[PDB]
Subunit: 398 residues, 4 copies
């Protein structure tokens, strides 16, 4: 018996007392962060114990048991290498290799304010393991990356049926044969989707509803808002105004939709800010069936998550979608600011961010990273989990 | 140390001798078939032991181990319930229920010859577990179902880069903007793919080679040829001759291709016969990373299997591909014979066969079953493996 | 010698005095109207002569010569049967038949205001000969019928080269590959054309200018404006706003176009009013090479008249344009109020008006008429003028 | 009276006799050729006189009446300037100038055998006036130019309603929405049209039925057949077999149609040979309401000649049809050998020939000519016959 104690002899080398930093280094290598919310109680009790004790703060069996008894379940999984990527220490070295090789990719043209030398990669696994390399804490806008997220919110609140009364499920002209936009990843679809979220309420409260929803998936990491970007998208969004009026003409919005107001809302949502780190948790929530991996909170119905990953796969890269789903085989969404919201189902989320776009408007370093990643690891949607050639499988040991 | 001995008392309740029927029963319930090629040695050693005496043979530790020792790796994996679906008996009960529901769907138009009340479904898991129900042993033609298999052969022999010099990878007019056919799931793509398989050799031996390949994928289960279908497809292949001549004009074939002969080959390949059972093993090879699960032989390269599963996802249902990959989320291919080649990556392959077709040319019961299957079990491409709502997961116990 | 005298005995059968009504009757029978502008001096001279006595006021050679000498060329051309249709009294009998056969056509749905039983036809030959039958003096709106006229204006003021930097000349999605609207008969094209008329000056004066121009083409017959139509067209021009924003994003307008203003103008232009009679003179000006046939003043350059007639042929019926150019072979534009602007080059212009439209939005009676017209008379663009089968040729005697 | 005598003093300057050569030069100047079939009798009687009076001829009134009394109608019309283009001698000056200006355009690629500096234009008016300059007696194949003619033949024998069951009449995909080819000027339409001409008979007599027909419209001038070309069009007619099988699939041909034998007929018709001269009469018959101008024989119904001219206008220049119909406005058809069958309705027919094609496959020198021609003369479809700015009008004198 004695769970908290089983752990205790695992981290102490058949010794009497664990040094506090040694437990912390043991914890940090599992990829978890000490700032992890599922660890607060443990980590508070740890700071308080350093506080009520002497300088050479060392934890005996009984004191270790006191701090860890509150989060022993997660702490046990973390230390028994039961997390989805057990040798997380090695995996992140490869993510570094992938980052550096993707960094030497110099091409591309920034949309038109940011520097073409920003290049950030954040990883968040379905179990909470974090890794980052490059400029991962800079705020940028989701832009078209918000489209999966707000479609998820719509489906989570209204169900696959209702949302898909107003938008289709097939890649793409503005409307398909049923006089609905083809799919919610294209602008015409996103605008109708935006017209479903929190109807009746006004755009100020709508925007807060989606803001708090994104906060839940980001594990309460940074979800911001660039009003500066908002002004530009609404001043030079002539293309979207075209879509808005056309949608209005073909009666695509729900009953009583203030079309010009839905467009302003829509311009706001494209202007929501994230960092690589915060958004990689958002991705990971989609990877994790709707449960935010660093909180354990259910944020999205599995219905909603499955749908969003589905359409991200078939419609998230626009015309490149067939090519991208062929070589990468991961659901992903792209953004003019240079972000790739990338989901490896059941394993992890990622955000890549390099502001230089390629000819198709996808961050060059992102796309190069995404290819490189699936080259290396058997994460392609149709790699075998048993016979995966010479690819490495992060999910296994030895 | 006693590998085969550990198994002995697992099957005999701390008793002296195991009746031979009890072991067989215990095997059949593991999902495996006594006729499994990977058990051939052991089943011969039992055919031998049943000769020394014509009375209910009881096997002691020494003589049991004498038969089981040649197949002990695979035999304990089954009895320790290590297979991809551990409780395989329960899982076939739901397959029966799913088969019965779809059987009540009497809609559909048979192409025009078969009988509209035939209906078989067959399962072959990645580990060789097999269940069938319905008319699983009647030969029917692959028709378009053959397109992923012969694509796979092409890429297996010539690789992604070469095969995709002649055909594209995105869903659909006959050519795309690069002057290649859109993808190998459509006739124009199928025809070009046919023209890559064993160039230089002639059409009689080409067809033998594909046939040897198709035998490998079915673990040497039933593959046949319906000449009657073959004459139909050539006598009425007016659209196909058009596609061929157009392909000839736009120089889509490789150097020195006899297009009018390539069409015959193509009509041959569509006329290949399978049954549910044999085809379910084929699908299962694509389920299993390219290893035929009932023989263990590597039949198709991971590269070839991945690509084939990719293009089935995006192009295997044609227009219905978005609709279908949204709700069902499994790579499939249909054929006018009534066949749905179904693949559940990493779990199993299937063939569904009911000749009544809907207005899209897909098996009515086949489609209904596919939908029920993902309704019931978390096999959808983008279900979570951890949070999957009230869906059942056959990969787990209890 | 003695022209005015030569005419004199032509009207008096070897007699001394001509009863003034008898000249009037002989005038009206050549087709001209006593209100004809080219006859105003003579009619002033006759009002004076009818002022000196109140008793039939017969005219001798001296007083007749005193009235008609100011308009003797036109008058002898009428009485010496030099006009484009000489036996014009006959020709209007057939226009009455055509009017009647077509009044029996009951189909159609009025767009949504008017009454479905209004039906007028107006003819004005290139020589000023006038005929009407039915409700030819009710004001209605041109709607899209205005699109040839304002295209004619643009080309007249800017020439073909300039106008066709901004719009194309082929039938049809909004833009062509040159990112110009397809042709100025489609709404996207009309809007671009609208933005070229009198750039710089504001929308109140731009409207005046087009109005002055429309006056020149109707020979100062009725042109009005329906603010009722105007507010409706702008309240519900959602599709036109969609088009306006799209054209703005694709940079289709000239530099410095207030696009939401150009739409307003456009709605104004569509709300302009004509009667059958006034619009038939407008048609007749395009019929007569750019000279208003009832005033003789050059309104439009031969360049502009040619381009307009050309684009009405190919683009004026939208979808019906091939069917119509095949069977009817007369350049025409249609309007949702029920207007068919008809042009028989070198012979006459015409207006038909019945508010009931068919499914393609063309006046039912209008279209039946146009087909009937070309059944009867060799006006089809590719009828022969020498061997026209059994068709009637109004251009000839006997 | 005596029309012959009135003609007689018109050539003789109030003098006793007419030198036979003076009458001949006066006749040739009107544009007629002495070989004109309508002049056969006159010219026979004339040659017989030179034999009967081997002096200096010189015909007195009685003798001139004896030669001309048989063709007096045509002969006076020629000499009283009654022909459609009365000052024909000056008109040919312009054709020569137009020819020389078009001769300096050396651009273009000959399709692939002929020489790039071959350039002939040949005119035949509706009245029989001839003029040619350059290589007008070299044989070349109609190629696509036969399409208007064989369409005309179809509608001659079977009428508008019937032919257009099987083919549409709107410009361009291989079929349209009605599953008929779009119009008889594209291959898809021409191949169906071919399958309507003289059904039931076999290809050997069908080709003589069409050949005797072309001979009539060419006034029995050269109509030949290149069996040389005919091999080329069938060896490399892959696209045509594409179209053929597709049309067979969609049952576009009439009941009991040998599609492979229609394709063979079709290749023959494309290989028929003409010269500029012989084909210029062919065009002219279309300009003349179906009457071959140099014979007076009615070769085609007016219904048929209308239809053909209509579709030449809208579909005869393929994608260039709208541009061409805008700037040139004449019905014309182009051919890969370098021919432009060109009709100026009611005025003349004409054939142009330069083998260098432009990017669109149209005789570079022909197209330049066609533009130069309508620049010069008010022959554009929507030119005014009364107000035509700086253009010349050959239909007038002075």
């Amino acid at each position: 018996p004695s769970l908290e104690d089983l752990l205790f002899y695992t981290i102490a080398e058949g010794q009497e007392k664990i040094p506090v930093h040694k437990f912390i280094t043991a914890l940090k290598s599992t990829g978890l962060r000490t700032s992890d919310p599922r660890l607060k109680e443990c980590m508070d009790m740890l700071r308080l114990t350093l506080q009520t004790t002497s300088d050479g703060v060392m934890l005996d069996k009984d004191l270790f048991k006191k701090c860890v008894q509150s989060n022993i379940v997660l702490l046990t999984q973390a230390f028994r290498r039961k997390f989805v990527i057990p040798d997380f220490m090695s995996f992140t070295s490869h993510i570094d290799e992938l980052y550096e090789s993707a960094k030497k990719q110099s091409g591309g043209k920034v949309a038109d304010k940011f520097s073409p030398d920003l290049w950030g990669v954040s990883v968040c696994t379905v179990d909470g393991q974090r890794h980052s390399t490059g400029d991962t804490k800079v705020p940028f806008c989701l832009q078209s990356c918000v489209k999966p997220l707000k479609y998820a919110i719509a489906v989570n609140d209204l169900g696959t049926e209702y949302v898909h009364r107003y938008v289709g499920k097939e890649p793409s002209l503005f409307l398909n044969e049923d006089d609905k936009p083809h799919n919610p990843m294209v602008n015409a679809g996103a605008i109708v989707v935006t017209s479903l979220i929190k109807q009746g309420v006004n755009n100020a409260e709508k925007f807060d509803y989606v803001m708090q929803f994104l906060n839940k998936m980001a594990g309460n990491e940074y979800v911001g808002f660039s009003n500066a970007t908002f002004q530009s998208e609404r001043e030079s969004g002539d293309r979207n105004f075209a879509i808005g009026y056309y949608l209005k003409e073909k009666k695509c919005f729900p009953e009583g939709t203030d079309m010009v107001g839905i467009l302003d809302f829509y311009f706001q949502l494209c202007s929501i800010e994230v960092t690589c780190e915060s958004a990689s948790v958002m991705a990971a929530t989609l990877a994790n069936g709707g449960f935010c991996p660093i909180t354990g909170e259910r944020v999205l119905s599995p219905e909603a998550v499955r749908n969003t990953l589905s359409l991200m796969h078939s419609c998230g890269m626009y015309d490149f979608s067939g090519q991208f789903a062929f070589h990468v085989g991961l659901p992903a969404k792209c953004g003019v600011a240079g972000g790739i919201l990338l989901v490896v189902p059941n394993v992890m989320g990622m955000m890549c961010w390099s502001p230089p776009l390629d000819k198709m408007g996808n961050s060059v370093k992102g796309i190069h990273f995404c290819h490189d990643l699936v080259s290396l690891c058997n994460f392609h949607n149709y790699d075998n989990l048993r016979h995966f050639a010479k690819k490495l499988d992060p999910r296994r040991e030895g």
